[PDB]
């Protein structure tokens, strides 16, 4: 069953999708988002349709070295993590502090103690890629802040 907050998130996402057609998305795609969230929760135990499932349905309907998805997965995690201390007002994060946070968001996905150093080494390399793309602005700690873009 759809949760109450899921209704607001769903109408927001449907507005976002309908904005882009100024094919073309109809309310059938809204029902399709509901139905895809139903199916994803059907592939789980919980009947509460959290906004996360609607996010996956939105991404799947909207989408019509290191591997692309693995690197991009690091992006949203670190982008929103830094935006947290912007609202919190806490101390800003160095590269090491960000990397320590990231691995603990995927402790269970880790398989071997050897992979403990492999993904850690990959995280710093991703930081260079992100800074090179200018999504983080380096200031001086070696402070990483959301780049002015």
């Amino acid at each position: 069953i759809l949760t109450k907050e899921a209704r607001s998130y769903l109408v927001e996402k449907y507005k976002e999708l309908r904005k882009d057609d100024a094919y073309r998305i109809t309310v059938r795609q809204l029902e399709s988002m509901i139905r895809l969230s139903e199916a994803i929760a059907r592939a789980n135990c919980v009947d509460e349709i959290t906004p996360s499932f609607i996010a996956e349905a939105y991404d799947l309907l909207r989408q019509s070295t290191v591997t692309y998805d693995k690197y991009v997965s690091m992006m949203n995690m670190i982008v929103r993590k830094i935006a947290e201390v912007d609202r919190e007002g806490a101390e800003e994060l160095t590269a090491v502090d960000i990397v320590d946070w990231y691995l603990l968001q995927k402790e269970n996905d880790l398989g071997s103690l050897a992979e403990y150093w492999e993904e850690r080494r990959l995280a710093f390399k991703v930081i260079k890629r992100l800074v090179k793309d200018r999504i983080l602005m380096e200031i001086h700690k070696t402070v990483y802040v959301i780049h002015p873009n």
Binding site: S52, E84, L103, L104, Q105, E107, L110, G111, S112, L113, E115, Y116
Partner: peptide
């Protein structure tokens, strides 16, 4: 959600994956 906020473990995180690895067999 963002539940894993502060699991500030020591160097035991290497020992953490030994449990993942050595017992999986």
């Amino acid at each position: 959600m963002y539940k894993e906020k502060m699991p500030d473990s020591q160097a035991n995180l290497m020992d953490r994956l030994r449990e993942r690895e050595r017992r999986s067999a």
